[PDB]
Design a protein around this nucleic acid. Structure first.
Lengths: 262, 124, 430, 185
RNA sequence: GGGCGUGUGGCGUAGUCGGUAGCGCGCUCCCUGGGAGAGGUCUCCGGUUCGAUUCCGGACUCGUCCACCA
RNA sequence: CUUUAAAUCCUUUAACGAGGAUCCAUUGGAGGGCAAGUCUGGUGCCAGCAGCCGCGGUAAUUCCAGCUCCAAUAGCGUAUAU
RNA sequence: UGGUGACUCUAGAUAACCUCGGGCCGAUCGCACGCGGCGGCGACGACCCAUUCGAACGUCUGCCCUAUCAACUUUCGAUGGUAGUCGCCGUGCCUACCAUGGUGACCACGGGUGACGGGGAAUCAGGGUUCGAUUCCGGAGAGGGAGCCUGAGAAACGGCUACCACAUCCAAGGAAGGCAGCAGGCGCGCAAAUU
RNA sequence: UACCUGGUUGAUCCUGCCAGUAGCAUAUGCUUGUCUCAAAGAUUAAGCCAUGCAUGUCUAAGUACGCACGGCCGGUACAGUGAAACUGCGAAUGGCUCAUUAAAUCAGUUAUGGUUCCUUUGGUCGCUCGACUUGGAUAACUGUGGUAAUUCU
């Protein structure tokens, strides 16, 4: 590598894209953006593989410049845009809004949101930046440099932005009793409440999070993303609600649906 | 006596067409050609047969079932808008280039040798 | 269109000189290459052969000053793309002269106008009479007589008219029509009247010849060539040589007698009996979509070694037969002795060079009337005409004269000459 | 970088001793009684028995109540009962060890044609597979090694396009008829 | 293909002022040794010539080397 | 027809298409190791075989042939690597 | 002011500095246009702060044979203290000045490798033995070495500048080259496809 | 399937190797009906290369006076396509090969508070106390040329 790479392999692409290894040699390289190449979902995957609007990549080429695609307020024309976490993709000609929340597994769930819920999004701050005139700042998880925050927004707070203006509405404290979105690693896709914070001078801290059905677990704070107060979230959840039942019960549930239908 | 039914019918408000997966039941006889599929699907939706673009057929063993997939448009202007160029010529309505790919390149980098207006003059 | 022209004539008549100089004035050769040959020729004490050196590429040819093998060159005329076939004028190489004449659609008979040279050329021992006879016997019906070396006789008109008169009476006895043959007084050395009218011959108003479209007139030798193709017949391209080029493979070279050769065609090589695919067809280092009758092409063949095919072999379309035996009417010309059954000389059919045995002498006919004189004669002598059954020593491909004329005429050779020439009546195909 | 499989698995295992009398007889009794075509598919069926028996053996080494033993055990016994190899009345992981080589040999489709009585011979039964003369669930099967499951047992029958079924009469009858009326005028 | 040679019995080889067709091994027969015997399209025909394996011509057969970069 | 950029092949459909279904399956072996003739003739410590042991000196179960037989079966032997 | 586990962090104040081979502060463009003058969609253009994309270096642990290699490293940096230069940065990276260290029987140093490393493949009861040039990640290099331009990013070779080897055309003055890219050709061969 | 068998001896029990036996590749030999898949110039020469080809690119929206087309509503610049040329960006990717290299490469792990970073995304960009838009080159093109010859000028 005498510089930056431009390509990505079908075999080395992340598995949560669920790419058939038999179709093509390459993978659609995610363009650089507000989300890393690991946890992104390029728009070509969302149209062709998750919803099957287009069949080939060139059939996504005609539709992306048709200017019908609205990722979180903005209309993008590049199919390789890194649509990350909770990016609101609304499409006008069907009037259908979408939002990326994880499944019980690591993949992204195809979730239709209501238009009253499609106008706002929660974002986790990364750092409290102090601007050049005593002006406080924050960068969210999707690279939104927001100036003049509420001063009580610390490093692990979640904030609620309105996409029509790009401004905050309310914030959620990183405190015990809050809902959590475990985003990364072996616990990628779990939704539970905060139980206990374990401090670590020098390394990454860990917080233990119990699921709603008592399946308690732990994950470091880097993957932890609080979303709600008490026992109620601020967004609409897909089916399963992030509980991660073991593989013994999915076999029962799967046979239960085919024996009830016939 | 070939009867055609529906599978996986969904609207394309994003693509100005409709798409449904074709199933064929042709007992005792061969795979029916794609031309006669269009008019049979035309009278099955009471629409015009010219924007019926079926392809991708695949027989199951022994015959009696062949499985394809096609697209039916809203109007002919979108059918000339969002479509691979070969599917136009599969009906024989559009004529592509008649130039061999080597003949394209053997002329192409031969225009790299001569600087000036003579780039259009080196070829023939 | 494309046409082939074979240059024939007595030795030292100026065939190579006239041909090499004609190619020069037609732009077929750059002036610097001529200047090189003129220096090399001067270094060997032969400065008067600078134009012949264009055709004579063999070391033996430059050392003796005589043409040995066939040389294939090109030049263009206002109407045709001419391929000249310079044939040897020496008796020992008449075999190469026959395989070169069986190709050409037209023949240019070079006759020296100098005193003594003309008489020696048309003598009983001269090749001028044998060449014109072989040319007409091989299929060449169009003839162009070029009275060369008119500069040695100071462009004398009476001398030219004398040569035209005697040559006309001769070619008429061979089978040619003097009216359809243009007589052009030239100077292969000075280049007079070859492409441009000469000022040294103010008496010469030009040549005139009768054609199927009427009477055509001209003055130069180039115009005589412009005043001159069995594409519908099966493919017949015999080999002259076989080359082994690095990266390409085996590349046989030859001229297309009948039919058309194209890249992708499945051809068969006889007598070798090898069938393969032609990958490409070239003509003077330029690729062609097809080789028509006349083109001396070099085609690349796949999976065939240079040891499986050789000079003398005939290539043809594998989709469009060999000969076990064939009956043909032959005319003994010059044979110092008697021709009996068992006699196995060499026959030059089209461009095939196979030795055939006079298996059986069927009938002896009168050369003039064609009436049968004797049945199953014990022997034949000079002047006799006869129907003989032939059996090739090696696999050979021939056709009946009535069906395919180009492949139905041949020449017989032995004891210092062309002892006979004949036409195939019937063929027993294998 | 070209997109293709490059995944190969040999479906059979040649035996260690090639020239002993004892093993030579048993497989001869299995070819002649079940109409097999070589000795390879004897060990091929013996190879897939060695896969399931080993997968059953290591589950016993994992102790009871283990979810992995509870899942992969019940997952394995789910398929054995659905293909007519093990009955419902013997559904337990201990019984896989006592499962023998001839047990899968009933569930070859070729035996089922000589079991359902629509073939004169077990060796005539394979030709009805080869000539596309029988179908299963409105699907013709041109391969005798199709492992019929317990569910399609009543769906085995002649093909729709068959002279020996409800289809066109064959070429021999169409040839014995053209001289049957062409010789009579 | 250009120049040079080689070819005569089963084998390989002589030879020939142009006139008789050989030797050796071999096969035959006889008493490794010796004797006799069978065994020839002299590459081929055509002439030259009183008579041709020789003298001429011709190509041929094989071996040889120079050429041969559509 | 389908397939595909255009094809090819696969699958589909009509026509033909095997009684010695001559539309003809080989590769290695047949002393032991190691499944498989004391078959027949030629060969006579010769030619050779055989991974090893060993066989050939004129009635060879091991060479060479034919007949028969054995293993694997569109594969199999051999060499060399492990 | 605000943060970290800990700042010489950020911001603020001040006293100055503003590098002529100069740090920004639109001397652009298109479609609709409605109200003297005011607008809309954007495109593009930049300096700086983050973001992503990486790279660059470090930390710890992990390698194959060999003692007929037992001592090595070092004023031609070896291991350090001090202070600079250079570099995008930490640092003997280099320069100066002092100190005498640094490694080794736990196998250093040296040699061999028919050695690109790793995921992995073949074989196997268990344990292992062998393989891994070969599609995935990363390293390294385009005859051999050296040097550079340009650019965010190269010591780039389907970019240059030398020497060395090989090699092309000439009018003999010169000019030009780099298939360990797809094919393909020779050579090498036991061994490997269609210009 | 955690498996042995023959050969030292007059015979025996042993040490003990040799040879069979099953794989897996590489070559090679004989043979070759169908069909699905699929390795393929690495080992010797990281040896040498002919030809051809693999890196170019324009939107309503950087610079259009090539009639090279082409509209007539024309004199208020250009209908508008538009080759060339200029500018901008890429050519540092991809592909191929494994020569070098034995704590080196690399792998796990972390560190960069010891560093830079095209583009993308999001913030900035009337914050400074003095134009209704400034300058002069140059390519394409027109025109004259050289050299045997170049992607020379």
């Amino acid at each position: 590598a005498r510089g930056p790479k431009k390509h990505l392999k079908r075999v080395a692409a992340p598995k949560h894209w669920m790419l058939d290894k038999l179709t093509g040699v390459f993978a659609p390289r995610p363009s650089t953006g507000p989300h890393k190449l690991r946890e992104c979902l390029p728009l070509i995957i969302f149209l062709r593989n998750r919803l099957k609007y287009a069949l080939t990549g060139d059939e996504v080429k005609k539709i992306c410049m048709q200017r019908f695609i609205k990722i979180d307020g903005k209309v993008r024309t590049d199919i390789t845009y890194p649509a990350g976490f909770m990016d609101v993709i609304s499409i006008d000609k069907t009037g259908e809004n979408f939002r990326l929340i994880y499944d019980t597994k690591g993949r992204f769930a195809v979730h239709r949101i209501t238009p009253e819920e499609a106008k706002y999004k929660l974002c986790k701050v990364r750092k409290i930046f102090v601007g050049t005139k005593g002006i406080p700042h924050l960068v969210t998880h999707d690279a939104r440099t927001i100036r003049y925050p509420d001063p009580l927004i610390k490093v692990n707070d979640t904030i609620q932005i309105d996409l029509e203006t790009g401004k905050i509405t309310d914030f959620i404290k990183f405190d015990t009793g809050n809902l959590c979105m475990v985003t990364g690693g072996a616990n990628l896709g779990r939704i539970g409440v905060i139980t206990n914070r374990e401090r670590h001078p020098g390394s990454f801290d860990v917080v233990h999070v119990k699921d709603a059905n008592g399946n308690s677990f732990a994950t470091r704070l880097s993957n932890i993303f609080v979303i709600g107060k008490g026992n109620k979230p601020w967004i609409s959840l897909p089916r399963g609600k992030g509980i991660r039942l073991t593989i013994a019960e999915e076999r029962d549930k799967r046979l239960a649906a085919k024996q009830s239908s016939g | 006596t070939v009867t055609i039914r529906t599978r996986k019918f969904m609207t394309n408000r994003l693509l100005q067409r409709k798409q449904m997966v074709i199933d064929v039941l042709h007992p005792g006889k061969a795979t029916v050609p794609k031309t006669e599929i269009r008019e049979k699907l035309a009278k099955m939706y009471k629409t015009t047969p010219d924007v019926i673009f079926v392809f991708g057929f695949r027989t199951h063993f022994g015959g009696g079932k062949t499985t394809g997939f096609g697209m039916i448009y809203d109007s002919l202007d979108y059918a000339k808008k969002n479509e691979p160029k070969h599917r136009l010529a599969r009906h024989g309505l559009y004529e592509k280039k008649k130039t061999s790919r080597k003949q394209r390149k053997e002329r192409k980098n031969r225009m790299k040798k001569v600087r000036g207006t003579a780039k259009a003059n080196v070829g023939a | 269109s494309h046409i082939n022209v074979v240059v024939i004539g007595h030795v030292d008549s100026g065939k190579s000189t006239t041909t090499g100089h004609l190619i020069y004035k037609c732009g077929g050769i750059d002036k610097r290459t001529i200047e090189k040959f003129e220096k090399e020729a001067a270094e060997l004490g032969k400065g008067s052969f600078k134009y012949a050196w264009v055709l004579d590429k063999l070391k033996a040819e430059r050392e003796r000053g005589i043409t040995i093998d066939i040389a294939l060159w090109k030049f263009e005329t206002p109407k045709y793309q001419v391929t000249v076939i310079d044939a040897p004028g020496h008796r020992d190489f008449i075999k190469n002269m026959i395989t070169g004449t069986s190709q050409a659609d037209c023949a240019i008979l070079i006759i020296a106008g100098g005193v003594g040279e003309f008489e020696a050329g048309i003598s009983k021992d001269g090749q001028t009479r044998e060449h014109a006879l072989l040319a007409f016997t091989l299929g060449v019906r169009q003839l162009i007589v070029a009275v060369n070396k008119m500069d040695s006789v100071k462009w004398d008109e009476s001398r030219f008219q004398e040569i035209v008169k005697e040559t006309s009476n001769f070619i008429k006895k061979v089978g040619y029509n003097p009216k359809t043959v243009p007589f052009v007084p030239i100077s292969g050395w000075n280049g007079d009247n070859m492409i441009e009218a000469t000022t040294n011959a103010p008496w010469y108003k030009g040549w005139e010849k009768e054609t199927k479209a009427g009477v055509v007139k001209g003055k130069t030798l180039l115009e005589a060539i412009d005043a001159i193709r069995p594409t519908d017949k099966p493919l017949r391209l015999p080999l002259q040589d076989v080359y082994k080029i690095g990266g390409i493979g085996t590349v046989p070279v030859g001229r297309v007698e009948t039919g058309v050769i194209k890249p992708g065609m499945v051809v068969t090589f006889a007598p070798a009996g090898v069938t393969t695919e032609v990958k490409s067809v070239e003509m003077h280092h330029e690729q062609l979509e097809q080789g028509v009758p006349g083109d001396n092409v070099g085609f690349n063949v796949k999976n065939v070694s240079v040891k499986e095919i050789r000079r003398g072999n005939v290539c043809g379309d594998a989709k469009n037969k060999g000969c076990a035996s064939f009956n043909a009417t032959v005319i003994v010309l010059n044979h110092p002795g008697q021709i009996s059954a068992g006699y196995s000389p060499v026959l030059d059919c089209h461009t095939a060079h196979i030795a055939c045995r006079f298996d059986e002498l069927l009938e002896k006919n009168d050369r003039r009337s064609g009436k049968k004189l004797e049945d199953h004669p014990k022997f034949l002598k000079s002047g006799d005409a006869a129907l003989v059954k032939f059996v090739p020593s090696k696999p050979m491909c021939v056709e009946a004269f009535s069906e395919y004329p180009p492949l139905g005429r041949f020449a017989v050779r032995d004891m210092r000459q062309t002892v006979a020439v004949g036409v195939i009546k019937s063929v027993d195909k294998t | 970088p070209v997109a293709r499989s490059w995944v190969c698995r040999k479906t059979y295992v040649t035996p260690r001793r090639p020239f002993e009398k004892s093993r030579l007889d048993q497989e001869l009794k299995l070819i002649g009684e079940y109409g097999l075509r070589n000795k390879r598919e004897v060990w091929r069926v013996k190879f897939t028995l060695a896969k399931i028996r080993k997968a059953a053996r290591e589950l016993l080494t994992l102790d009871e109540k283990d979810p992995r033993r509870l899942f992969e055990g019940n997952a394995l016994l789910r398929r054995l009962v659905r293909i007519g190899v093990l009955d419902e009345g013997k559904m337990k992981l201990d019984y896989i060890l006592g499962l023998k080589i001839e047990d899968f040999l009933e569930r070859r489709l070729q035996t089922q044609v000589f079991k359902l009585g629509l073939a004169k011979s077990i060796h005539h039964a394979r030709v009805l597979i080869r000539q596309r003369h029988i179908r299963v669930r409105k699907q013709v099967v041109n391969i005798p090694s199709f492992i019929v499951r317990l569910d399609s047992q009543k769906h085995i029958d002649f093909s729709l396009r068959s002279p020996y079924g409800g289809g066109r009469p064959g070429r021999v009858k169409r040839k014995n008829a053209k001289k049957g009326q062409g010789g009579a005028g």
